[PDB]
Structures are given as structure tokens and as C-alpha cells.
From Swiss-Prot, chain B:
<dbReference type="GO" id="GO:0055117">
    <property type="term" value="P:regulation of cardiac muscle contraction"/>
</dbReference>
<feature type="binding site">
    <location>
        <position position="55"/>
    </location>
    <ligand>
        <name>Ca(2+) 2</name>
    </ligand>
</feature>
<keyword id="KW-0677">Repeat</keyword>
<dbReference type="GO" id="GO:0031982">
    <property type="term" value="C:vesicle"/>
</dbReference>
<dbReference type="GO" id="GO:0010856">
    <property type="term" value="F:adenylate cyclase activator activity"/>
</dbReference>
<keyword id="KW-0282">Flagellum</keyword>
<dbReference type="GO" id="GO:0099523">
    <property type="term" value="C:presynaptic cytosol"/>
</dbReference>
<dbReference type="GO" id="GO:0032465">
    <property type="term" value="P:regulation of cytokinesis"/>
</dbReference>
<dbReference type="GO" id="GO:0019855">
    <property type="term" value="F:calcium channel inhibitor activity"/>
</dbReference>
<dbReference type="GO" id="GO:0060315">
    <property type="term" value="P:negative regulation of ryanodine-sensitive calcium-release channel activity"/>
</dbReference>
<dbReference type="GO" id="GO:0097720">
    <property type="term" value="P:calcineurin-mediated signaling"/>
</dbReference>
<dbReference type="GO" id="GO:0005509">
    <property type="term" value="F:calcium ion binding"/>
</dbReference>
<dbReference type="GO" id="GO:0016240">
    <property type="term" value="P:autophagosome membrane docking"/>
</dbReference>
<feature type="binding site">
    <location>
        <position position="94"/>
    </location>
    <ligand>
        <name>Ca(2+) 3</name>
    </ligand>
</feature>
<feature type="binding site">
    <location>
        <position position="128"/>
    </location>
    <ligand>
        <name>Ca(2+) 4</name>
    </ligand>
</feature>
<dbReference type="GO" id="GO:0046427">
    <property type="term" value="P:positive regulation of receptor signaling pathway via JAK-STAT"/>
</dbReference>
<feature type="binding site">
    <location>
        <position position="64"/>
    </location>
    <ligand>
        <name>Ca(2+) 2</name>
    </ligand>
</feature>
Length: 65, 143
């Protein structure tokens, strides 16, 4: 039921991680437990991934609505 | 658009484009994600590409990366959809959502963020010790 509920959840979460990522000392970075001591080629990577994640959560939410 | 910005995006694009063919395939992107301790599904890889994919050839050329990197993640009506995403959770109608319900939503539903992230969010949100957030100030935070 209510398929907007996860899409709404997903939309908000991806947008915040997109924004939080611009702070290089946000706790949104400690989430990469398999990456011991992240380097600078990691953040360029994470940052772009996170943008494309926010976009799909934009589409999926539209679809529901 | 800055020459600094394009430069750095060019550097970024090279991080995904390992074979130097100027294309990013759904299998190259999964490499990178899996490098970061992730597991994506063949569809999840196929949904990300299909969002950045204006040529329909299945690949990401550098100009579509640049299109996506320079998109108004804050101006392209980003604030209207993010509003109505919150309004799925104000059944009271008040432009207010309990900080507790927020945590429960940010942590159990959708992408399920870590508690420390949720702690950061609520603190920097409109929680001025009112265990309510007016998401009006939230949507603007991110934009
Ligand atoms: Ca390639
Ligand atoms: Ca392409």
C-alpha cells in the first residue's frame, strides 16, 4: 500500500545525502565502512554517484504521483 | 560555467571511464560503487544510467555527465517535489513533522540512513527544541 511512502522517503534521503556530501566533515561520509580512510578520489566518486541517486529518486517519486 | 568546474568534472569522469572510450557503461559504474563497499542490482545500475541518458545509446558520454553535474538540483522545481514528499507525512496538514517521526522515516523507510546522519539532520533542521520540524525550513536547507 501507499507506494509514495517509500518514494517520498527515498526522495528526501537522497537529496539530503546530496547536500550533506558538500560538507567534507559531515557524518554522511562515515557510512562507507568498507572504505578504510577515504582518499580524495573517493569523494569525487561518491559525490557523482550521489547525484545520480537523487535523480532516480526524483523519477520514481513522480511515477508514483 | 567555470573552467575550474569542468576541469574537476573531467577528472571525475575519468574515474568512471577506465577504458578511455569516453563512455560510462552500466558495468563500469558498478565497479566504482562496488569499490566503495556497495552492492547494486543490475536494474539499479540500469536506472541510474537511464536517468543521465539523453542519447539512448545506453552509455554516458562526457557531455551527459556534464549535463547531469550542472543540473539545477535546487532550482529545477526541486523544492516543489521535496515539499510534496514531506506532505506524504504531514497527515495533520500542519507544515510540521515530529522530529521523532522524521528519525523513524529517515531510518526505517527508503534508503534507511545511519543514526548519526539523522542526528546531524534534525540538529541542523528547524528543530529549535520544538520536537517538530517545519519542513519549509528543511526544503530550503538543501536548496
Ligand atoms: Ca567505458
Ligand atoms: Ca552515452
Amino acid at each position: 500500500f501507499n507506494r509514495q511512502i517509500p518514494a517520498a522517503a527515498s526522495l528526501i534521503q537522497t537529496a539530503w545525502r546530496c547536500y550533506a556530501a558538500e560538507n567534507p566533515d559531515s557524518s554522511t561520509w562515515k557510512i562507507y565502512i568498507r572504505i578504510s580512510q577515504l582518499r580524495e578520489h573517493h569523494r569525487a566518486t561518491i559525490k557523482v554517484i550521489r547525484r545520480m541517486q537523487y535523480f532516480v529518486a526524483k523519477k520514481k517519486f513522480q511515477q508514483a504521483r | 560555467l567555470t573552467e575550474e568546474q569542468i576541469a574537476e568534472f573531467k577528472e571525475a569522469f575519468s574515474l568512471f571511464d577506465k577504458d578511455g572510450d569516453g563512455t560510462i557503461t552500466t558495468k563500469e559504474l558498478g565497479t566504482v560503487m562496488r569499490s566503495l563497499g556497495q552492492n547494486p542490482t543490475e536494474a539499479e545500475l540500469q536506472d541510474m544510467i537511464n536517468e543521465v541518458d539523453a542519447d539512448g545509446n545506453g552509455t554516458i558520454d562526457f557531455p551527459e555527465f556534464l549535463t547531469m553535474m550542472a543540473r539545477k538540483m535546487k532550482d529545477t522545481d526541486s523544492e516543489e517535489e521535496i515539499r510534496e514528499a514531506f506532505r506524504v507525512f504531514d497527515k495533520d496538514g500542519n507544515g510540521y513533522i515530529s522530529a521523532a517521526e522524521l528519525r523513524h522515516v529517515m531510518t526505517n523507510l527508503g534508503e534507511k540512513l545511519t543514526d548519526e546522519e539523522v542526528d546531524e539532520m534534525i540538529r541542523e533542521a528547524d528543530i529549535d527544541g520544538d520536537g517538530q520540524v517545519n519542513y519549509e525550513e528543511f526544503v530550503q536547507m538543501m536548496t
